[PDB]
């Protein structure tokens, strides 16, 4: 009886085939606009080094030992104070990608309806796809989800939850404005629906102020149905894998129960280190994050405006890390990617961001990682690839 | 008015057991001496060397350490694991604890109603991970010499489990040690039927005798059989709180684990992997020898104490490695009830029930001698003896 792997795997093995995540993470003179990797010039290496050594010397017996599933209590407290909730309503997760996996586990079943935008974040699609749901979509544009399309969906289908990224959506960069957020909240409250609000880019706004979150608006309305995800990845360090979920206790409790068997607890040194880094100077750190991303976005748009012919369209984000690019109808972003690689530049083709397919002429560009000169040079290389693609028609 | 209970899916009903989160916050009750969680001896933690190493990593390589990193793990760590275990680097996946490896295995191999084979009892974390997928648990008893192979033969004549989950070396929770001939017989049974084994080797290095037994993975590799997925961890030998472990498998299986890991957490934190690699680059053998000495001495301290304080109606194992003593009360007596009395005497342990996937074992309990110094072991056992005497006096 020779062993067959294909025959020994379960259904889960046939739902995890997309490889965008590992392909974006994989470790020469290629300039990357691919993964949403935060600017390394913002990492506080020296402060981190001091703080990590102090933790390990003075509290190493706690930091290196098994620790609570719910998270380091001072970090839960810091998060609660920042977000505006009780500490017991905060779960520390091993990145918000883990919170998405936990959400999928708690809420989805084979064939269960779930709603997100087309496009939306590939990580969330991948986490949810594991459970074998039926994906329902609405379009995403410059002002967020198409609420008219959503109204029609909700007449016929009750999603297990709605997954949204109101602030600088991955991958479009779209910003759901305040009146739309209120309308959306009304639509959800009228049917007692659950919303998973992913606020990874919360603090990366380019204007004067952050918009109220769906969670904030819900809290004001007395409505308990928003599960709120945030992360320290975009504002401090993605490699530490420290993030959080905030919810009504009944929901949060299920997330904590799921977390036990996922990894026991998020590494304790990491939580301690985030807390030590942010307990002073957080406001100021966030202001500097905004100034850097504003400047890189400006450089990206200047470079694109210079190098990209008008037959190719792209968004002009008001925050976050991404530009979203649309090629002429029927042109292949995958084909372009192969040409870009020969020109020593990378991006993410758009296909993985569309849960039910389509989008093969779209692509996402991240300006977060490179400095302004590498942005300018990377876009010059992209422009050459685009020009090659268009010239073949 | 929103209804949470109606909003959840089936998974919300399969995650109710709270043993894990309960064991992990016992620290919040510092006056209680713990024989509960398998928390490693903190006197072994290399705090100073770790502080120095972490600071050097963040100053010299902080742009790698603090950035998004490969799903498969830090390459020098993969290589280090590959050299230690005896495989190619590309056959290693770094995981956020072996608990995550368990969750990944469940994801890849189990569906609702699918059969899975494990012992009764077995590790509650594995039970918890697998239960999420809604499987049918098949069991065989576990004893001093590991799984009951005659019982296993009967199971395998009737069913093809998606995998067999075993812990051949110092099983959680019994401390059982599967001897070499039983390992070969198990291997033969699985090879003849083309089944998969998940071999959890958390306690690999914690042997009290002269040498480590061959793993089922090593035996399978010698026989040319690709069906063993091998799990190991740095938790019991270096630091559990860092959450760094590994899965080793044939590339076809390993690839599905890597695929699953993407959407679980993107990647295991990179500083943690670097730190583990830096700490183990030199002196690993000597570290391991020290681990063995310490747990050998704590096991001896525990048995000495039990032998003086525990009434002879109560049975307990005498482990040859690992972290645990497995205790069985007279039939019908409640480990849970004993636990409540133990809490009143300021000692904790883990009742046996969570370790039995299909129920049972309500008279059994696990004791961990890993965490306390010898004086705390002696005092905790005096406190446990008082609880036990109170339990037995009520009859
Ligand atoms: C919208 C959104 N939500 C969550 C995540 C996950 O981030 P953490 O787990 O670090 O908190 C993200 C991250 N996005 C990048 C992931 C790559 C694998 C690097 C990306 O390039 O999309 C997110 O955008
Ligand atoms: C047999 C066995 N396999 C895996 C694990 C998980 O450990 P890591 O994820 O740290 O690698 C364990 C650990 N066991 C303890 C867990 C408690 C929550 C602390 C235990 O008390 O059982 C294991 O024993």
mmCIF file with all atom_site columns, C-alpha atoms in Angstrom, chain B residues 193-260:
data_model
loop_
_atom_site.group_PDB
_atom_site.id
_atom_site.type_symbol
_atom_site.label_atom_id
_atom_site.label_alt_id
_atom_site.label_comp_id
_atom_site.label_asym_id
_atom_site.label_entity_id
_atom_site.label_seq_id
_atom_site.pdbx_PDB_ins_code
_atom_site.Cartn_x
_atom_site.Cartn_y
_atom_site.Cartn_z
_atom_site.occupancy
_atom_site.B_iso_or_equiv
_atom_site.pdbx_formal_charge
_atom_site.auth_seq_id
_atom_site.auth_comp_id
_atom_site.auth_asym_id
_atom_site.auth_atom_id
_atom_site.pdbx_PDB_model_num
ATOM 1  C CA . UNK B 1 193 ? -1.253 0.295  5.610  1.00 0.00 ? 193 UNK B CA 1
ATOM 2  C CA . UNK B 1 194 ? 0.374  3.479  4.227  1.00 0.00 ? 194 UNK B CA 1
ATOM 3  C CA . UNK B 1 195 ? -0.784 5.622  7.201  1.00 0.00 ? 195 UNK B CA 1
ATOM 4  C CA . UNK B 1 196 ? 0.588  8.875  8.487  1.00 0.00 ? 196 UNK B CA 1
ATOM 5  C CA . UNK B 1 197 ? 2.085  9.430  11.892 1.00 0.00 ? 197 UNK B CA 1
ATOM 6  C CA . UNK B 1 198 ? 2.464  12.781 13.651 1.00 0.00 ? 198 UNK B CA 1
ATOM 7  C CA . UNK B 1 199 ? 5.258  12.219 16.168 1.00 0.00 ? 199 UNK B CA 1
ATOM 8  C CA . UNK B 1 200 ? 5.426  14.881 18.841 1.00 0.00 ? 200 UNK B CA 1
ATOM 9  C CA . UNK B 1 201 ? 8.924  14.997 20.281 1.00 0.00 ? 201 UNK B CA 1
ATOM 10 C CA . UNK B 1 202 ? 8.610  17.885 22.715 1.00 0.00 ? 202 UNK B CA 1
ATOM 11 C CA . UNK B 1 203 ? 10.388 15.880 25.473 1.00 0.00 ? 203 UNK B CA 1
ATOM 12 C CA . UNK B 1 204 ? 13.043 14.402 23.039 1.00 0.00 ? 204 UNK B CA 1
ATOM 13 C CA . UNK B 1 205 ? 16.034 15.634 25.067 1.00 0.00 ? 205 UNK B CA 1
ATOM 14 C CA . UNK B 1 206 ? 14.591 15.170 28.564 1.00 0.00 ? 206 UNK B CA 1
ATOM 15 C CA . UNK B 1 207 ? 15.662 11.531 29.010 1.00 0.00 ? 207 UNK B CA 1
ATOM 16 C CA . UNK B 1 208 ? 17.027 10.396 32.382 1.00 0.00 ? 208 UNK B CA 1
ATOM 17 C CA . UNK B 1 209 ? 18.947 7.310  31.094 1.00 0.00 ? 209 UNK B CA 1
ATOM 18 C CA . UNK B 1 210 ? 22.175 7.145  29.105 1.00 0.00 ? 210 UNK B CA 1
ATOM 19 C CA . UNK B 1 211 ? 20.779 7.732  25.609 1.00 0.00 ? 211 UNK B CA 1
ATOM 20 C CA . UNK B 1 212 ? 17.821 8.829  23.486 1.00 0.00 ? 212 UNK B CA 1
ATOM 21 C CA . UNK B 1 213 ? 15.757 6.154  21.748 1.00 0.00 ? 213 UNK B CA 1
ATOM 22 C CA . UNK B 1 214 ? 15.483 6.344  17.893 1.00 0.00 ? 214 UNK B CA 1
ATOM 23 C CA . UNK B 1 215 ? 12.436 8.408  16.959 1.00 0.00 ? 215 UNK B CA 1
ATOM 24 C CA . UNK B 1 216 ? 9.707  6.988  14.774 1.00 0.00 ? 216 UNK B CA 1
ATOM 25 C CA . UNK B 1 217 ? 10.912 9.569  12.243 1.00 0.00 ? 217 UNK B CA 1
ATOM 26 C CA . UNK B 1 218 ? 14.475 8.208  12.325 1.00 0.00 ? 218 UNK B CA 1
ATOM 27 C CA . UNK B 1 219 ? 13.177 4.612  12.051 1.00 0.00 ? 219 UNK B CA 1
ATOM 28 C CA . UNK B 1 220 ? 10.922 5.578  9.124  1.00 0.00 ? 220 UNK B CA 1
ATOM 29 C CA . UNK B 1 221 ? 13.817 7.340  7.356  1.00 0.00 ? 221 UNK B CA 1
ATOM 30 C CA . UNK B 1 222 ? 15.969 4.181  7.773  1.00 0.00 ? 222 UNK B CA 1
ATOM 31 C CA . UNK B 1 223 ? 13.144 2.081  6.257  1.00 0.00 ? 223 UNK B CA 1
ATOM 32 C CA . UNK B 1 224 ? 12.613 4.684  3.450  1.00 0.00 ? 224 UNK B CA 1
ATOM 33 C CA . UNK B 1 225 ? 9.043  5.393  4.580  1.00 0.00 ? 225 UNK B CA 1
ATOM 34 C CA . UNK B 1 226 ? 7.945  9.059  4.059  1.00 0.00 ? 226 UNK B CA 1
ATOM 35 C CA . UNK B 1 227 ? 4.879  9.012  6.327  1.00 0.00 ? 227 UNK B CA 1
ATOM 36 C CA . UNK B 1 228 ? 6.155  10.483 9.641  1.00 0.00 ? 228 UNK B CA 1
ATOM 37 C CA . UNK B 1 229 ? 5.618  14.189 10.367 1.00 0.00 ? 229 UNK B CA 1
ATOM 38 C CA . UNK B 1 230 ? 8.008  15.052 13.139 1.00 0.00 ? 230 UNK B CA 1
ATOM 39 C CA . UNK B 1 231 ? 7.370  17.873 15.611 1.00 0.00 ? 231 UNK B CA 1
ATOM 40 C CA . UNK B 1 232 ? 9.951  19.357 17.943 1.00 0.00 ? 232 UNK B CA 1
ATOM 41 C CA . UNK B 1 233 ? 10.226 22.504 20.046 1.00 0.00 ? 233 UNK B CA 1
ATOM 42 C CA . UNK B 1 234 ? 12.647 24.792 21.782 1.00 0.00 ? 234 UNK B CA 1
ATOM 43 C CA . UNK B 1 235 ? 10.135 25.231 24.628 1.00 0.00 ? 235 UNK B CA 1
ATOM 44 C CA . UNK B 1 236 ? 11.351 22.474 26.949 1.00 0.00 ? 236 UNK B CA 1
ATOM 45 C CA . UNK B 1 237 ? 15.091 22.958 26.295 1.00 0.00 ? 237 UNK B CA 1
ATOM 46 C CA . UNK B 1 238 ? 15.523 26.752 25.996 1.00 0.00 ? 238 UNK B CA 1
ATOM 47 C CA . UNK B 1 239 ? 12.421 28.968 26.383 1.00 0.00 ? 239 UNK B CA 1
ATOM 48 C CA . UNK B 1 240 ? 8.683  28.248 25.957 1.00 0.00 ? 240 UNK B CA 1
ATOM 49 C CA . UNK B 1 241 ? 7.797  31.948 26.106 1.00 0.00 ? 241 UNK B CA 1
ATOM 50 C CA . UNK B 1 242 ? 9.706  32.686 22.877 1.00 0.00 ? 242 UNK B CA 1
ATOM 51 C CA . UNK B 1 243 ? 7.304  30.436 20.931 1.00 0.00 ? 243 UNK B CA 1
ATOM 52 C CA . UNK B 1 244 ? 9.821  28.799 18.514 1.00 0.00 ? 244 UNK B CA 1
ATOM 53 C CA . UNK B 1 245 ? 9.410  25.261 17.298 1.00 0.00 ? 245 UNK B CA 1
ATOM 54 C CA . UNK B 1 246 ? 9.524  23.195 14.150 1.00 0.00 ? 246 UNK B CA 1
ATOM 55 C CA . UNK B 1 247 ? 7.849  20.670 11.896 1.00 0.00 ? 247 UNK B CA 1
ATOM 56 C CA . UNK B 1 248 ? 9.882  18.272 9.731  1.00 0.00 ? 248 UNK B CA 1
ATOM 57 C CA . UNK B 1 249 ? 8.304  16.235 6.939  1.00 0.00 ? 249 UNK B CA 1
ATOM 58 C CA . UNK B 1 250 ? 8.478  14.911 3.398  1.00 0.00 ? 250 UNK B CA 1
ATOM 59 C CA . UNK B 1 251 ? 8.282  17.984 1.065  1.00 0.00 ? 251 UNK B CA 1
ATOM 60 C CA . UNK B 1 252 ? 4.737  17.203 -0.132 1.00 0.00 ? 252 UNK B CA 1
ATOM 61 C CA . UNK B 1 253 ? 3.408  17.286 3.422  1.00 0.00 ? 253 UNK B CA 1
ATOM 62 C CA . UNK B 1 254 ? 5.709  20.071 4.523  1.00 0.00 ? 254 UNK B CA 1
ATOM 63 C CA . UNK B 1 255 ? 4.462  22.263 1.678  1.00 0.00 ? 255 UNK B CA 1
ATOM 64 C CA . UNK B 1 256 ? 0.839  22.012 2.886  1.00 0.00 ? 256 UNK B CA 1
ATOM 65 C CA . UNK B 1 257 ? 1.944  22.971 6.412  1.00 0.00 ? 257 UNK B CA 1
ATOM 66 C CA . UNK B 1 258 ? 3.752  26.018 4.997  1.00 0.00 ? 258 UNK B CA 1
ATOM 67 C CA . UNK B 1 259 ? 0.654  26.873 2.954  1.00 0.00 ? 259 UNK B CA 1
ATOM 68 C CA . UNK B 1 260 ? -1.515 26.713 6.110  1.00 0.00 ? 260 UNK B CA 1
#
